[PDB]
Curated annotation (Swiss-Prot):
Keywords: Carbohydrate metabolism, Chitin degradation, Chitin-binding, Copper, Metal-binding, Oxidoreductase, Polysaccharide degradation, Secreted, Signal. The copper metal center seems to be reduced from a Cu(II) to Cu(I) oxidation state prior to binding of dioxygen for catalysis. GO terms for molecular function: chitin binding; copper ion binding; monooxygenase activity. Disulfide bonds: none annotated. The lineage of its organism: Bacteria, Bacillati, Bacillota, Bacilli, Lactobacillales. It comes from Enterococcus faecalis (strain ATCC 700802 / V583). Pathway: Glycan degradation; chitin degradation. One of its GO terms (biological process) is polysaccharide catabolic process. Involved in chitin degradation. Catalyzes the oxidative cleavage of glycosidic bonds in both alpha- and beta-chitin via a copper-dependent mechanism, leading to oxidized chitooligosaccharides with a dominance of even-numbered products. Acts synergistically with the chitinase EfChi18A, and combining the two enzymes leads to rapid and complete depolymerization of crystalline chitin, especially with beta-chitin as a substrate. Is likely involved in a chitin degradation pathway that allows E.faecalis V583 to grow on chitin as a carbon source. This is Lytic chitin monooxygenase. GO terms for cellular component: extracellular region.
C-alpha cells in the first residue's frame, strides 16, 4: 500500500494530507494508498480507480475536474509514501501523448512509457524518491500514470497524477 505524494496523485489530493484539493473521491479521501489491482490491468476509463470498488469517482475525466500540479518539462522528482512496504519488482511511469483529449476516458493506448525502474526484489523504504524525465513535446494538462509492481504478489498499485506542464 502506497501513493504518490509529490506531485500529489489524484487520489492523494482527495485526502486531508493532500489538502482536499480534489473533492468527491470515494475511498481516496481516507485510503489513497489502497488502489491495488493485478499487474497489467489497463481498462479504458478505469485507470484512475484500477477498477477497484469504492474508487469509481476517480475515473471522471474532464479538462477541469481535477487539481493539477504545475511542473516543467525535463526532470521531475516523484515521491511515494508506502503505508505498507512490500518487496518490489518494478516502478513504471507513463504519460499522456501530445494531442490527447482531456474530456475522454483514459486509455493506456494514449500514453507513452517514460521510465522504468527495477525494484530488484527488495523491500523499499517508506519514502521512495525517483527522478523521471518529462518529454519536451508535452505542454498543458497531462496525466502521469505511476505503477508500483509488487515483487511477491501478482498485483500493483496504480496512481494517476494530474499535471500542468509549462
Ligand atoms: Cu500493501
Amino acid at each position: 500500500h502506497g501513493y504518490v505524494a509529490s506531485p500529489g496523485s489524484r487520489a492523494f489530493f482527495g485526502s486531508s494530507a493532500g489538502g482536499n484539493l480534489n473533492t468527491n473521491v470515494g475511498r481516496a479521501q481516507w485510503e489513497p494508498q489502497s488502489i491495488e489491482a493485478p499487474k497489467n490491468t489497463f481498462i479504458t476509463g478505469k485507470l484512475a480507480s484500477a477498477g477497484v470498488s469504492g474508487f469509481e469517482p476517480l475515473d471522471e475525466q474532464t479538462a477541469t475536474r481535477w487539481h493539477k500540479t504545475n511542473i516543467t518539462t525535463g526532470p521531475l522528482d516523484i515521491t511515494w509514501n508506502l503505508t505498507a512496504q512490500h518487496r518490489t519488482a518494478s516502478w513504471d511511469y507513463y504519460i499522456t501523448k501530445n494531442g490527447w483529449n482531456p474530456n475522454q476516458p483514459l486509455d493506456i493506448k494514449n500514453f507513452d512509457k517514460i521510465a522504468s525502474i527495477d525494484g530488484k526484489q527488495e523491500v523499499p523504504n517508506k519514502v521512495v524518491k525517483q527522478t523521471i524525465n518529462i518529454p519536451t513535446d508535452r505542454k498543458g494538462y497531462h496525466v502521469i500514470y505511476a505503477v508500483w509492481g509488487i515483487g511477491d504478489t501478482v498485483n500493483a498499485f496504480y496512481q494517476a497524477i494530474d499535471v500542468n506542464i509549462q
